[PDB]
């Protein structure tokens, strides 16, 4: 129950769950949620809120879809903005982004803190210092931006970034990263509308794998 249950994947790691997989955690208001724990990468204890791997799931979705979450525990998913807010509300959480290209290269980026606000604040990103990683830094430029989807434009562009770049993100005008973009399978001719992390592979290369995950700082 909520009284003794784990709050996140680090609690689960501490209790001896050493394999990655789906486990029940209890959010701050006691709402139970099934989450994916990455117990392997970089010490383990990471709660995964976004996964792309094969293009099986459509990510070009509306506000309601991103709010509640969508996809599959067996594959690709977005955990949901209400869930991500709740998970990052208590304490301080570090963010790790893991990427794999189509050539087999693994790259990563790490940030010292990560929070998303509530729906009233349009799931605004509150991002701490870049730590490092082979992927470089394509998220700091998104700090303090609201989340936007195709049907709800909260970006700082005269354009509709989510529609123009075919994703959903804390778009500014418009992006350095676009991990909820189209699954375009490596090099693409269209500009900046793929699973792009521009500090590493630029605006015309879409990654094979994306994983976004959090753990107590």
Asked if residue 155 belongs to a known ligand binding site, the reply is yes
Asked if residue 157 belongs to a known ligand binding site, the reply is yes
Which residues of the shown chain bind Ca ion in the complex (CB under 5 A)?
Answer: 153, 155, 157
How near is the Cβ of 175 to Ca ion at its closest, in Å?
A: 12
Q: DSSP string of 170-216?
A: --SSS-SEETTSB---EE-SSSS-BSEETTTT-TTEE-SEEEEEEEE
CA dist 46 → 4, 102, 188, 194, 203 (Å): 20, 24, 31, 25, 28
CA nearest neighbour of 41 among 13, 15, 78: 13
Q: Which is nearer to Ca ion, 20 or 160 (CB)?
A: 160
How near is the Cβ of 190 to Ca ion at its closest, in Å?
A: 20
Residue with tokens 């690709």: 76
Angle at 188 between CA 193 and CA 79, to 5 degrees: 40
Asked if residue 9 belongs to a known ligand binding site, the reply is no
Q: Which is nearer to Ca ion, 113 or 143 (CB)?
A: 143
How near is the Cβ of 61 to Ca ion at its closest, in Å?
A: 18
Q: Which is nearer to Ca ion, 86 or 172 (CB)?
A: 172
How near is the Cβ of 161 to Ca ion at its closest, in Å?
A: 6
CA distance 130 to 135: 11
* Beta strand pairing call for 196-197 and 32-38: unpaired
CA distance 186 to 197: 12
Asked if residue 153 belongs to a known ligand binding site, the reply is yes
Q: Which is nearer to Ca ion, 113 or 157 (CB)?
A: 157
How near is the Cβ of 82 to Ca ion at its closest, in Å?
A: 23
Q: Could you tell me how many residues make up the chain?
A: 217
Q: Which is nearer to Ca ion, 101 or 153 (CB)?
A: 153
CA distance 127 to 130: 9
Asked if residue 40 belongs to a known ligand binding site, the reply is no
Residues belonging to the binding site for a carbohydrate are 173-175
């Amino acid at each position: 129950s909520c009284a003794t249950g784990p709050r996140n994947c680090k609690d689960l790691l501490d209790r001896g769950y050493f394999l990655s997989g789906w486990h029940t955690i209890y959010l701050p208001d006691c709402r139970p949620l099934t989450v994916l724990c990455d117990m392997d990468t970089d010490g383990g204890g990471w709660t995964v809120f976004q996964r792309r791997m094969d293009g099986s799931v459509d990510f070009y979705r509306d506000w309601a879809a991103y709010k509640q979450g969508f996809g599959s525990q067996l594959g690709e998913f977005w955990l949901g903005n209400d869930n991500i807010h709740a998970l990052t509300a208590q304490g301080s959480s570090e963010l790790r982004v893991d990427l794999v290209d189509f050539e087999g290269n693994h790259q990563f980026a790490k940030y010292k803190s990560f929070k998303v606000a509530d729906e009233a604040e349009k799931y605004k990103l509150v991002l701490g210092a870049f730590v490092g990683g082979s992927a470089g830094n394509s998220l700091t430029g998104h700090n303090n931006n609201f989340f936007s989807t195709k049907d709800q434009d909260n970006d700082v562009s005269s354009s509709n970034c989510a529609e123009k770049f075919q994703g959903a993100w804390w778009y500014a005008d418009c992006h350095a990263s676009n991990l909820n973009g189209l699954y375009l399978m490596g090099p693409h001719e269209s500009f900046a509308n793929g699973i792009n992390w521009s500090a590493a592979k630029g605006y015309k290369y879409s990654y094979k794998v994306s994983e976004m995950k959090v753990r107590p700082a």
